[PDB]
Structures are given as C-alpha cells and as structure tokens.
Design a protein around this ligand. Structure first.
Ligand code: MG
Ligand code: MG
Ligand code: MG
Ligand code: MG
Ligand code: ZN
Lengths: 162, 174, 222, 97, 45, 176
RNA sequence: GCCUAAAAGCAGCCAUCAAUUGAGAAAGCGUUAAAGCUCAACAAAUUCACCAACAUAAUCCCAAAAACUAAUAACAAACUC
C-alpha cells in the first residue's frame, strides 16, 4: 500500500510516497478457474451484511468503497457488496472504518438507534402517515432486492417489503 | 471466457506499420522527444525551423509503435515511448543545429534517440553534437597514428636543436 | 488511437416526388349518412393488415389498439413535415383517412330516444400495425429521435421501429416463446379446456393466447 | 492543465522537473511536466521559467517550485500519481500566493 | 541480436572491446607493417 | 489582452464599427489604430481588403501584422466580376485560367500561413482552386482568346434577367 | 460565395473544396455583429454505460409484527371416511 506523507521544515514542503507491505490472496482457492474473486472463492450467493470479514477486505479506512477496476469483481457482485457495506455501516458494524474527528467526538448527540437490514438512508425517508388499507398497503422495504438470489436453506423467500 | 477471437489487421494499421518501417529503415538520425502541448502557431514555427535544417517531425500512435519497437531491434527505447511522443527524423544527422534550435525552448526536453544504430540519451546527443565532423576525425586519425614516427623524428633531430638553442640563448644573453 | 470504420452510403434509395406527408381530410368526400354501430372488434385483437414494410425502412409501430382522428392526423403530419429533411427523407401513411363515424348526443339528454348524431370520424388501429413509414438516405438514430415524439403523442403505446428492430423483437418473442421454462401455457390450457377455464375465458382467447386483453397488448406475455 | 489555468499561476517564479526518461517510474512526472508546461499555463503567466532537466543516472524523478513568496515546494515523485501531484501543487499554490 | 545499453557519463568506465582489440592488432605487428598501414591509409584517406 | 482578426480595406480605415467598439472595449484607442493602419497601407491600392491581426497587450498597447489580400478579392479581380455567384455549382460567375491561379498563388505564398507552413506552390494552387470553386468561378485548362467575352455577354444577360426577376419577386412579396 | 445595418461555423440560400500524422466552410451554447465555451480528428488512456423514475380531500392512521432451524408442512367445510 502507498502512503503520501508531508514534511514541513522551514517553509519547505516535501511530499513523499512510501510503499509498505500488503497481504496477498490465500494460496489455495476452491475454484481457481473462476475469473471473479467472489465467484472463484465460491462466496456467490453466500455473503450478507453481517459478513464483515468479507466486506472489509476491499474498502477504504474511512468506510468508502474500492473501485471495481482495481478490485476485480463482476458488476453484479460489486453492486451487491456495495449495498452490503452500506447496510453494515448503517447497522453499526465496522466501527473503526470512520474518520477520526477529535473536535467532533466530544459534543455527544442523541444515542444511536440500533438498526439492521436498512435499505434507504435514515436522513431521506419520510414517515408513512397513511399506511394504507389491506388492499392498498404501503409496505416498508427491508433489506435490498440485490440479495434476492442468496441461498435459502429454509426454502422460504426473503420478505423484502415488510 | 471463450477462446480469443483473433482481431484482423486493417489498412490503417498496415499503412502505419509500413510507414514506421520505412522511417526506421531509410533515415539515420531518429531522435525521440517529448511531445509538449504548445500553441499551434509555435508548433508551426518549430516546424519551419526544422524544415530549414531539413529535419522533420513525426507522430505515431503508441498502439502501433510499441509492438513494432519490441519486435524490431529498438527494444531499448521502450521507456521512452509511453507518454506523448515526437520522432525527429532526418537524413545526414546534424545534431548541432538541432540542439541549437531546441535550446531556445526551455520546457521541450530531449528524451533520447539513435544516431546510426547507436542509442544515445540527451547527454549522448550533446556529446555527438560537440564532436567534430567525420571528415575532421578521419583526417586526424592518420595524424594520431603517424604521431609516433613524428615524435621519433622530432626527438632524433632535437639533439642538434638543443645545442642550437644553447647558442641562441648564449647570444641573447649579451 | 481508434480504427477508422467506413460509413454507410445510400445510393440505391430514390427520393420520390412530394416526400412530405399528404393532407388528410377530417370528413370523407362522401359522408356516411347511415349511422353504424361501434364495432370494437376493429380495435380488439392483433392487426392483420399493414404489418410489414412496403418501401420505407423505418416506421411507427402501434403496440396497442385505439382510434386515430383528425387531431392525431394533423399532429403527425405537421410534426413529421417540420422535422423531416425533404431532400434526403420521405414519409408515407399506412392508415386510411378517418372513415368510421362516431355518434354523439347533446348534454342533458336522457337515455333512449334513438341514436345520436355523427360528431366526427375515426380510423381504427390494431396492435402491431404501422402508422407512418419513412425512408431515404438517412440513418435510424435521427429518425427514431424525431419519431419518438409522435409515437408518444399517439393515443395507443407506440414505438419508432425499423426493419432490423422489428425483426429483432419478433425473433426475441419467438425465442422467449420457444425457451419458456414452465410447462403450463395459456394457449395449451385454453385449447385443452383444462380446469374448465373456458367458462371464464372468451372465444377470442383461443387465438389471442392471453397476449391481448380488450384493446391492450402485453408483448412479454409469451 | 485546465485546473491550473483556472487557478491564476501568476504568483510562481520557477518550476523545474528533473527526471531520467530511461526509468520505469517517470510516467507520472512526465505527465506532470506536460500538464504544467501546457499552452494555457504558458499564457496565464509569462514570467515563469519552466525547466525540464533530463538525466540518465539520477534515477529519482522530482519537481521543484520556487515561487515569489519565497516558498519552495519540493516533491520527489517516485510513486505518486500525476493526479495527486497536480492536486497537491494546485492546493499549495492556492494556499500560499 | 539486440542493441546496446546506452550508458552515460555519470559512471562511464566500460569501453567496447573492439577499440581495444584494434589496439592489440596494431601493437602485434612490426614496423614494415606500420609503414604499409600508413601508406595505405594515406593513399585511401 | 489578446489577438483580434479583422479584414480591413487598404486605406479605408474608419473609426466606427465593426472595429471601433471592439478596440474601445479592449482599451486601445481607435484614432491611433486608424492612423497607424493608413500609414502602413498607404502604398496599397485603396479599396482592396486584407486580413490583419491586432495583438492588444494588457498595458493597452497594440501591434499590427498585415498580410496578403483576400483570395476572394484576388479571384474576383482575375475574373473581372464585382460580386460572386449566389448558387455555387449551378451557375458560373467568371472564368480564371490556371496561369492566373498560379500567379495568385505566387503572390499569396508570402503570408503568415504559407510562411509558417513550408509548403510548395502546389498546395497553394489547390487552395486557390478550392476557393474559386466555392466562389463559383470556373477554372478552364487553356481557354482565353475571345470566348471569355463570349461567356461574359451571357453572364451579363443572366445578371440582368436575375435583377429583373429579383425586383419582380420583391414587388410580388410587397403586394401580397 | 449571395442577402442583410451587421450574417465571421452557426435569420437564411448555394457549394461543402484545400495543408498538415491529425481539425465539419461546422453538430450544440454565446455576441447586434465579433469574441468566447464546447463537440467531433490525431497524438493519452482505455470499469460498465440504448429506453426506462409522475401531487393531492375533507370526524381519526389503521390488526400487532416479522428478510433464514429444513414446507408438495401443518391448520382449515353442510365434502368424504
Ligand atoms: Mg401515448
Ligand atoms: Mg474531443
Ligand atoms: Mg402540490
Ligand atoms: Mg378438519
Ligand atoms: Zn463474478
């Protein structure tokens, strides 16, 4: 991994780039002939928002996603993993993947409400005051429709709107 | 993925390959310079100054120049042909006036090139420009070869010249 | 660096005289004096006429059924004439002039008393029929761009198709209807009268195969 | 080049890019030179001196900017991206000057 | 076959062996051969 | 400030638009520019137009660079017509010989464009031929003894009929 | 090139040629007219990139809730044993 460092010594600015050692892929994948990382490690339709050990492999230390041209995922798996990382960040997993603000960490605010499988952003959804009748019911979306192809061991489909 | 669908060569890339081959085969001085983004009026001015000394500039796509270069005997020019490129092509390599006219523009750096199958850097080009003419050096090689016999004759004739100079200084003393 | 591809050249196409769309009359030269019933079968079902290209290369395809009257005709004519190039493009109709009389009654009239009075004329259009057909030495991108407006302003759903796009969509429909996975199809069940479904179905459903419902047409319904 | 032209480079005296074109890590520095020596960057200020030092055995490509605030920005670019160097140089120029 | 390495003047210490081998072919011959060499070189060049 | 292109007459440099407001907004005065232009082109036949480039500097100073006259003017003069043809390709305006084209190319080669471009006279002759094709002037190989006048008579009759037809169309549009 | 007060790629009509490795008498903004900002062409790279999203009524919203422990389950009639 490359790091950009700045040195200030008497109105002289030195910008330097330092390369450190990075971990590599595990030596024995279960499906070596697969072109995609997930689809060759056999994690397709297997991960979720809880699998932080997989979602944290390719994200920036400030919680941002990594480009597909650099990672190598197929487009659908990239979108799925992006939505899963969003849902994990909203649910509260990956707490060390946030920027450190020493000036903003002191003014504590209202306690964080616990949530999970959050599809939209908490600051953009409006409360459903009408809620509809039985025939026209305003259903509340839960989870993402991109994870509708995951393996269902119980056989029942996932209720994406409830 | 399925096997490779081999892409077929077209007339444009054939023309480009043939032109690059003709350039690398016919002329002698092949200088590589960085294609700097200047005003087209200044580009035309440099083109005029180049055609004054009968040297031309060419621009070829990397996609057709890199494979030809790594297939030919010019594989040592690969670190030069990555970014923007300018091929200074000329018969009768005369680097003196070339470096003279390139010195006027400060931020147009000479990358390198080849002088008669001799790959040189900027310092090599400067040294070749400062080097005398081929006629001068081939006339001076004969002198440097016969210099041994010349100094032998001078040192065998210096013995009477020593006494001669002794007599001259003794005369000049008074 | 990108390769230089050749451009399509049109020399065999001939632009005929009067390439613009001709004016259509609101009422035919001989008005129908006898009032006719509103047969909705001229809207129901698939189109049998004007389903293929005659001389042009692009057209406006109707994915549903409806009525075209003088307002629609004038809209299409004006838009196409003002957005076309008469030196390189020509257009022609594929639907006749409004001929079917539509009767109306005054406001405040009670039910009964007889038939109303002929208000205006319409042109019945079924699903899958071409409305305007264009050709010339032009490409499809510009024609599609300026024909999507007319296709949207038409009553029924419509698309700006060409020969290639029409054949592509028909072959795609064939591929879907041939590689469908579930063994139960509307055509099979209706033809075999499985579960006694003919009691709720219609005698025209045996030919519509569940793709046409009234005046609407669902092209993704096999 | 456009981001530099829209910055008002009038407050810079000398910019020298010293590199060796026969290396494997001079791509970013060469593009930095071509971006800082564009026509728009030339015409936005004519008092600036842009030098391109070409060596063969230096093996350490770097850039040096001395601008009239008495300020010296020195960046030894061996692994930095051209975009990162451009943004750093632009932010520093707009911060001091 | 390939091209040269194109060295610079920073650490220039290796000369091509041809200019040394010509010096050895020069220094391995006699004075009559030196006379023939410079007479031939003076007539041709 | 920047460069300004302007096709100005030889000695007819008026201090009004379409050159007054531009130089005034740039900051340079107009009377000084007109004086300089007239003293620089006093040796030129007053009336013929030529392109020039005015480089206005940030200190409200200006320099002038005058080039060769317009190719359209050269062709109109060599053909003997005052105004070009309206419908190029369908009608013929004048008749110019390749000799006249070569002379025009030789006189025009000493300009900014063909000076910055080291190019033989062949491409300049090609440019003159293209400009003549745009103007509507035909270029015959070797045909000028009296058929030039024979075509000039027909051209004058055509221009007279065209003027009468234009007046008739104007009157029709007026009474309609 | 004509028209026009001005018509400079761009109210309009006609041609649509010409050098450069490479740039349309110009496909969009802009000026009274220029200027100026883009698009396409070379040189620099090359993740994917065609259409698809659309407010509302009056007494008070309207079961509560729930995305994974195995389901051609189970519970369910005046039907049938
Ligand atoms: Mg509609
Ligand atoms: Mg472009
Ligand atoms: Mg509202
Ligand atoms: Mg029971
Ligand atoms: Zn994949």
């Amino acid at each position: 991994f490359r790091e950009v460092v700045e040195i200030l010594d008497g109105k002289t600015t030195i910008i330097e780039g330092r390369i450190t050692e990075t971990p590599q892929e595990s030596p024995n994948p279960p499906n070596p002939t697969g072109q995609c990382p997930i689809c060759r490690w056999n994690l397709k339709h297997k991960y979720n928002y809880e699998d932080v050990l997989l979602l944290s492999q390719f994200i920036r230390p400030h919680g941002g996603m990594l480009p597909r041209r650099i990672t190598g995922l197929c487009q659908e798996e990239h979108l799925k993993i992006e939505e899963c990382v969003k849902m994990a960040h909203r649910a509260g997993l990956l707490p060390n993947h946030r920027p450190k603000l020493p000036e903003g960490f002191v003014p504590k605010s209202k306690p964080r409400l616990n949530r999970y499988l959050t599809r939209w952003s908490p600051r953009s959804v409006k409360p459903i005051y009408n809620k509809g009748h039985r025939w026209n019911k305003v259903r509340m979306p839960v989870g993402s429709p991109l994870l509708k192809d995951n393996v269902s061991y119980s056989g029942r489909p996932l209720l994406l709107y409830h | 993925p399925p096997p490779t669908p081999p892409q077929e060569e077209t007339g444009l890339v054939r023309l480009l390959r043939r032109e690059i081959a003709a350039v690398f085969r016919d002329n002698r001085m092949i200088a590589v310079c960085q294609h700097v983004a200047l005003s087209a009026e200044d580009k035309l001015l440099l083109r005029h100054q180049l055609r004054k000394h009968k040297i031309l500039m060419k621009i070829f796509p990397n996609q057709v120049l890199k494979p030809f270069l790594e297939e030919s005997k010019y594989q040592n020019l690969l670190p030069l042909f990555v970014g923007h490129n300018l091929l200074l092509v000329s018969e009768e390599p005369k680097v003196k006036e070339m470096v003279r006219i390139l010195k006027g523009i400060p931020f147009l750096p000479l990358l390198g090139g080849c002088i008669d199958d001799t790959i040189l850097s900027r310092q090599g080009f400067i040294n070749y420009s400062k080097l005398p003419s081929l006629a001068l050096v081939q006339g001076e090689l004969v002198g440097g070869l016969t210099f041994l016999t010349a100094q032998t004759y001078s040192m065998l004739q210096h013995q009477p010249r020593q006494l001669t100079a002794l007599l001259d200084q003794y005369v000049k003393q008074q | 660096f990108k390769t230089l591809l050749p451009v399509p050249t049109f020399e065999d196409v001939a632009i005929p005289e009067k390439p613009k769309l001709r004016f259509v009359e609101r009422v035919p030269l001989v008005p129908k004096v006898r009032r006719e019933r509103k047969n909705l079968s001229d809207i129901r079902g698939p189109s049998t006429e004007a389903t293929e290209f005659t001389e042009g290369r692009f057209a406006i395809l109707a994915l549903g059924g409806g009525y075209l009257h003088w307002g629609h005709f004038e809209m299409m004519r004006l838009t196409i004439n003002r957005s076309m190039d008469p030196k390189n493009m020509f257009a022609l109709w594929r639907v006749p002039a409004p001929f079917k009389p539509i009767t109306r009654k005054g406001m405040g009239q009670r039910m009964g008393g007889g038939k109303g009075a002929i208000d205006h004329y319409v042109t019945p259009v079924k699903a899958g029929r071409l409305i305007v057909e264009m050709g010339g030495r032009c490409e499809f991108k510009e024609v599609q761009g300026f024909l999507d407006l007319v296709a949207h302003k038409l009553p029924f759903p419509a698309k700006a198709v060409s020969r290639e796009t029409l054949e592509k969509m028909r072959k795609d429909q064939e591929e879907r209807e041939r590689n469908n996975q579930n063994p139960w199809t509307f055509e099979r069940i209706a033809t075999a009268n499985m579960l006694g479904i003919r009691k709720v179905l219609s005698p025209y459903d045996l030919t519509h195969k569940g793709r046409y419902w009234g005046k609407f047409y669902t092209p993704e319904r096999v | 080049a456009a981001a530099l032209a829209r910055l008002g480079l009038r407050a810079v005296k000398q910019v020298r890019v010293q590199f060796c074109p026969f290396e494997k890590n001079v791509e970013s520095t060469r593009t930095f030179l071509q971006a800082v020596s564009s026509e728009k960057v030339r015409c936005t200020n004519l008092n600036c001196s842009v030098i391109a030092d070409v060596r063969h055995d230096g093996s350490e490509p770097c850039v040096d900017v001395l601008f009239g605030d008495g300020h010296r920005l020195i960046m030894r670019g061996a692994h930095l991206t051209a975009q990162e160097m451009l943004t750093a140089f632009a932010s520093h120029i707009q911060a001091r000057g | 076959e390939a091209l040269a390495g194109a060295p610079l003047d920073n650490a220039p210490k290796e000369y091509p062996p041809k200019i040394q081998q010509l010096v050895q072919d020069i220094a391995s011959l006699t004075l009559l051969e030196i006379s023939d060499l410079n007479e031939l070189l003076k007539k041709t060049l | 400030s920047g460069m300004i292109r302007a096709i100005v007459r030889a000695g007819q440099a008026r201090p009004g638009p379409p050159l007054g407001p531009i130089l005034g907004q740039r900051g340079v005065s107009i009377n000084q520019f007109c004086k300089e232009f007239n003293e620089k082109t006093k040796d030129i036949k007053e009336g013929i137009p030529l392109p020039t480039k005015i480089f206005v500097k940030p200190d409200r100073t200006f320099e002038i660079k005058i080039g060769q006259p317009t190719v359209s003017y050269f062709l109109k003069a060599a053909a003997g017509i005052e105004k070009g043809a309206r419908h190029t390709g369908k009608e013929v305006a004048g008749l110019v010989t390749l000799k006249h084209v070569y002379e025009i190319a030789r006189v025009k080669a000493q300009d900014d464009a063909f000076a910055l471009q080291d190019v033989p006279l062949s491409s300049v002759v090609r440019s003159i031929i293209g400009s003549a094709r745009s103007l509507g002037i035909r270029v015959v190989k070797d045909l000028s003894s009296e058929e030039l006048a024979a075509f000039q008579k027909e051209r004058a009759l055509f221009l007279a009929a065209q003027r009468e037809a234009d007046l008739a169309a104007q009157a029709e549009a007026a009474k309609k």
